[PDB]
Design a protein around this ligand. Sequence first.
Ligand SMILES: Cc1ncc(COP(=O)(O)O)c(CN[C@H](C(=O)O)[C@@H](O)C(=O)O)c1O
Ligand SMILES: Cc1ncc(COP(=O)(O)O)c(CN[C@H](C(=O)O)[C@@H](O)C(=O)O)c1O
Ligand SMILES: [Mg+2]
Ligand SMILES: [Mg+2]
Lengths: 388, 379
Amino acid sequence: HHHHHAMSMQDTLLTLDTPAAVIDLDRMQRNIARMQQRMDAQGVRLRPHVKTSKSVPVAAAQRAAGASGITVSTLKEAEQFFAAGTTDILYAVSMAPHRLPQALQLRRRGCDLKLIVDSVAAAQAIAAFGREQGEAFEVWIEIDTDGHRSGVGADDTPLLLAIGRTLHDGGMRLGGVLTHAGSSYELDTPEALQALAERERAGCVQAAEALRAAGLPCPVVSVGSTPTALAASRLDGVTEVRAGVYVFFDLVMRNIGVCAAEDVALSVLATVIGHQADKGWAIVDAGWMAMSRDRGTARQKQDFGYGQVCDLQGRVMPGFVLTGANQEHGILARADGAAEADIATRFPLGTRLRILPNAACATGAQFPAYQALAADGSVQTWERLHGW
Amino acid sequence: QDTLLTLDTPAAVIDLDRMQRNIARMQQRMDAQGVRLRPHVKTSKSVPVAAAQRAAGASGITVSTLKEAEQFFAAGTTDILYAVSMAPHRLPQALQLRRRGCDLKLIVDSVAAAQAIAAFGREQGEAFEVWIEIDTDGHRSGVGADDTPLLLAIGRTLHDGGMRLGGVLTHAGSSYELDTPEALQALAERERAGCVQAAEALRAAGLPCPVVSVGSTPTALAASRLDGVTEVRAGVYVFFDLVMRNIGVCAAEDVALSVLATVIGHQADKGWAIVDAGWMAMSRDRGTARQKQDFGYGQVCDLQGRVMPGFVLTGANQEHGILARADGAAEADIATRFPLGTRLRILPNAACATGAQFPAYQALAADGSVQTWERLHGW
Ligand SMILES: Cc1ncc(COP(=O)(O)O)c(CN[C@H](C(=O)O)[C@@H](O)C(=O)O)c1O
Ligand SMILES: Cc1ncc(COP(=O)(O)O)c(CN[C@H](C(=O)O)[C@@H](O)C(=O)O)c1O
Ligand SMILES: [Mg+2]
Ligand SMILES: [Mg+2]
């Protein structure tokens, strides 16, 4: 009854509508194990950044493999994962004072939500609101270890101490420091990545040691980007590493050199809807609205256009990429710029293909849900969050 | 009331007075040319935005996915053109829409797609309406404007197959690479001429071709005449954006969509203010990078919507935007100018891409109040 109805209802890659975001669950599990084993080898916790998937069943797999808590990039993510049972949540974006009532309400409901700041003004806002509301917020100080984005300079002891004392004197819980070495995205050699992972570790530990030297607590030291989590040779002084895009990987990571195209677990299922035979084009229904506008591979060692073409079995078809994209139309052609002869027999109308993305975080956000592909060929819909 | 001070950020704000001026401008131009306007709702995917275009005199809509056809049909719109080469596997979905009472039109540019439609139509008892897409500028899909044998083959497949051959359409998307009035005008003419040529060639062989449909926002606004055309399709004009501004068909002040963002910190050394509108809010669209003025991830405006030339988002990560001087200098005391919590509005490179990042717009009225207007995501 339940059985017979569910079979006659269950989808495969041939029955799905296109475009669709497909997770190869076997590749996803191998990626989750690889990262968790590496952090276990290092004796550090893994606090996965769920911004890559924003999907409960994906985070559940990461927790099942040994992850401790999660990092989120929005309070919407904190709300969704808290409602799904995660209590240990780091909101790793410089806290806006106007979001303080939502952060308070989450903590009041039982979410052990941590906030981050990098300025004396944001620390004063949190501490003043905490005092007025009788709430000892936990706050960590964000450190700039590579010049990329937010944070207090690791060697700026006077600002570190001013922010740490503002929090501690004001009765908040100064819980740690964190950094994200996002400049790792510019590198493409194991040497350079190892040296940057060492700078990220050294600088975040240096900031923790300056706070402690002044008598302030700083029990957590949190570092990480996917490339540096995979390349660090040593993590002395670090308590946890944050990494997110690893769960799926993507062609940017492939080009950085921390994975192979065959480790990429996310692909976009697409149908061939036409051709321009004289130009060697196949037109597919995955345009930039499916792939996203991310072109992070354009300035790396191999430009994959709007994505690398794979056959329906997920095997790369070398030399064919989406060379261009409009909103709902992707232009499939030879990467080397030749006109494929007979493109229409190589890619007949109605043929389905799988496109590996430049950037899994940007492609995944284009979809309300993923289709999680099991080894038997069946798919299940895994919702993910959109918006704020 | 909800207002720009009480909204969480980032938020996609439509300035309704600007939107309405854009709606009126395009409709008035299409009336002056004697053609119907069939707005492309892929820019907003929002019922009340399309409702405002229809109230101004629009005739039917164009959609980029059947999910939009479902949404707008469920909202009472029946005259729907799905202007993406039809995939045969979507024929059961198109059929169910037509049987439910949606006057859904499909397009094709190949004999094989026409044969798949006609064979399915006959089997199911449905005379699908299908238009043939014409390639008038080499940009994307379509039958070559002087490829008569292909055009006819398709036309005969449809008409002789018992389908309704309803028209020809073209989209001169190469207009996006232009940035002068003379060039846009010449491309609009080449777009018109080639679409008409194709209609005349169908008619000369005894085949029906009652609709001749052309358009992109730039060519709709540049075309000097539209003889032989029955309708124009345009979509991004409803809000405009910086790519359109650089093409030359609008001013930055006409852009009706902005992203409301909060300053969450600084890098005072480098003269940066960090905002909570990163590329997840703006999208990764960098269409202005290849134009004559690059606006990074968007042009900064103050909370009142006044443009602040010279400040743009020079960089963006997923949830962090880097606001800094376009001239590359380090603004001195950027923190004193934009203290923590300051709200700003960012104009997008591409309104279609930026709007897709949000589950809804915040529609801003003259009294400063906002109403949330949901829009569609996905397929
Ligand atoms: C604060 C913080 N922690 C960890 C991570 C995860 O790094 P990846 O696994 O390398 O993604 C990030 C991720 N942030 C950036 C982004 O903001 O876009 C990164 O994903 C990128 O694409 O540059 C983070 O912010
Ligand atoms: C088939 C078709 N008709 C009309 C329009 C509307 O043109 P704009 O108003 O200029 O957007 C489009 C729009 N298509 C492209 C796109 O597919 O990305 C255009 O919006 C662009 O940014 O190039 C269309 O496809
Ligand atoms: Mg990323
Ligand atoms: Mg567009």
